[PDB]
């Protein structure tokens, strides 16, 4: 809910003016493959990494690439953050800070 409120509003704002780059990033974030249902924890992490600004630097033709690699990295290394997300249900300030850490470090790696 916390992430999707702002995501819905930003997607609306983009749809009336079709910012504009953030909206393109969000739509390319919404695209999904077939028979690939994500978890709610992973979903909220992706839409976080999308709405907090860490993707207005990439070109959309590599957005899905970034999310594939980022999901691989997070599910391979950061099961405790996602476990806390699945347990609490809120993106606490501790969880928000740790997720900021993870996304900035991976964006540096990418």
């Amino acid at each position: 809910k916390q992430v999707a409120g702002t995501m819905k509003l930003e997607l609306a704002q983009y749809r009336e003016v079709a910012l504009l780059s953030r909206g393109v990033r969000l739509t390319e974030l919404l695209k999904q493959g077939q028979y690939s249902p994500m978890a709610i924890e992973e979903q909220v992490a992706v839409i976080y990494a999308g709405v907090r600004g860490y993707l207005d630097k990439l070109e959309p033709s590599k957005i899905t690439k970034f999310e594939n690699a980022f999901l691989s990295h997070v599910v391979s290394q950061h099961q405790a953050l996602l476990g806390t997300i699945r347990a609490d249900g809120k993106i606490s300030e501790q969880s928000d800070a740790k997720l900021k850490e993870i996304v900035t470090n991976f964006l540096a790696g990418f």
């Binding site: 690699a69 691989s72 391979s76 790696g109």
Partner: protein
Amino acid sequence: LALKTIDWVAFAEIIPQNQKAIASSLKSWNETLTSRLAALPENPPAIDWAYYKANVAKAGLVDDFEKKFNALKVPVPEDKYTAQVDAEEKEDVKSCAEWVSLSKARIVEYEKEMEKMKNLIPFDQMTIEDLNEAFPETKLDKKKYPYWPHQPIENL
């Protein structure tokens, strides 16, 4: 499997331009293995026999299979390349250990050079024969120009 973590941002800057394709292609092979390795268990589910011992109407086939399967030693390929790439590194470090040594010489020089220009006489007490040893830029070319003013009149 004792993997070693790698800071890709550090890996990105220590490659020379003449071989970026190799090091980039090495990156390509890297993550492709990481997922593929994680996308399947280390060992397959060893299939049951009890479901095959009794529900198969053949005699001997359901055992000699399990016997030959257990008596099958699938060869794991030996490394035969880890020491060969390690042969390069130890030599590389040797070629780089000397470089950080020679840099130390070229640094103890500069710090000794810089303290000179850090302690130059207050210019009010300085002589034109002292300004030449400090700034060799200012010494006139008494060999190219033998006569006064020992420099191009335009430069003057």
